Amino acid sequence: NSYKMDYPEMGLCIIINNKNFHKSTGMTSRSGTDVDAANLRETFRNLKYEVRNKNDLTREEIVELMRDVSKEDHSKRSSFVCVLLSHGEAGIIFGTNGPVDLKKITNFFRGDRCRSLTGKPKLFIIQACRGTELDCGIETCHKIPVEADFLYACSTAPGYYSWRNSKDGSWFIQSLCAMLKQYADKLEFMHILTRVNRKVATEFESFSFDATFHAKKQIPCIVSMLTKELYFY
Template sequence: MDCVGWPPGRRWHLEKNTSCGGSSGICASYVTQMADDQGCVEEQGVEDSANEDSVDAKPDRSSFVPSLFSKKKKNVTMRSIKTTRDRVPTYQYNMNFEKLGKCIIINNKNFDKVTGMGVRNGTDKDAEALFKCFRSLGFDVIVYNDCSCAKMQDLLKKASEEDHTNAACFACILLSHGEENVIYGKDGVTPIKDLTAHFRGDRCKTLLEKPKLFFIQACRGTELDDGIQADSGPINDTDANPRYKIPVEADFLFAYSTVPGYYSWRSPGRGSWFVQALCSILEEHGKDLEIMQILTRVNDRVARHFESQSDDPRFHEKKQIPCVVSMLTKELYFSQ
């Protein structure tokens, strides 16, 4: 929704591969880079201006966080133990697995007429940027386009039933229209909780105590942010074999593009504010900063660097702030 459009640069052509979970699946191994002058697919909804931002909500809705005396030999032993522990800190998730994990991107652009939802122009730019960004981190990325509610449920249920024993974590990115607590499939709405519940600790055992990350680009209501001017201990059965329970909702992280009740902004020419900021920060610091540090910087980037531009005064010069809900129990670094 900025005034000046960016040059198109290079695009990625995502080829369909039926072996990747359906005709809408797209695998990393089937991605080829193509120049803009070599037949890139044009965005739908060309009537939308690339300079005017949109919101992921219904079009008719306009109302609007050791002892000093220890012997030398003992000191050497203590230092040795400390060094060993530092190699795998207990306060960090263990990322030393064969794979980083799977990343599923659900990119809903077109919607059935009955939903009353418009084409989400700019979302393909988000999907392409996220594909390249998460693949560069080490994820196995698959993109699915224009999924129905049943298809979204089926995709995530099957993903939760896969064997993630050799994976460090799991990520899912939802790009669609939305309202509070729900997200749109191409044919209607489905509760976000129903999609994420497949990965609870009691249902997806191979991801138990591993981070499960959900990034959601969608509106969560119809409010608009005008902005304001500002100056610059486990219980053990035995000592030898400790057993403990993990809350089934633990180790989840939800990164929403906006706070509850508010619109989420998207530029048809450049993609959504949240995804632009997320990809930018991940490219800069994805392998050296902890996930909450990354998302805090994303919050700052969106809050300070974006402001809507619209011919409709009701939607002009509006702001946005993402929202992170974390049930992670350890620090998360994508680097191994």
């Protein structure tokens, strides 16, 4: 009923942290993202993941990184974690010089394409916009599918902007790290992520001099194709 998490290694945690984008793209610098990346590094280090931080990657460097990691031998590793911190749109995360399709990235890890991860949880944690909607809130052959064992922990609902504080980091990553620190020794991962949903939904609200962007809310979106319960302990 739960994934085997007592392989010799918990696995890799790849963190792609895009802060500065090529001028020609017109994309703004993502102030606060270094806070997220540092928090994520410490959070996952404590969970015994082998963390690799990558900063300011082009669209082709992202693809090449993911391809290479998917070709590593993960036989001794329990799981795989990839964190993407960038601008985005529906289905898309941005490299510093242009977009990468998320499906292209995740496909490298399919059950038939990365055999040393077949049957093990593959977790993709994404802090990026998924569109431009704002939430105004309301007061008060084979044997297993190749798409199985993926979880996407998305920072925001489909179609919506995702919020990041330039001083504190992104709402979602702040909350995800806090909940993992507090509950990773107590709760199954889906229940941890539900607590993240509640923390983001209840404790954060945007403040802006621009009325269009002021007093806005956010709900993260858990997408699970997992087949077992996931415990980090």
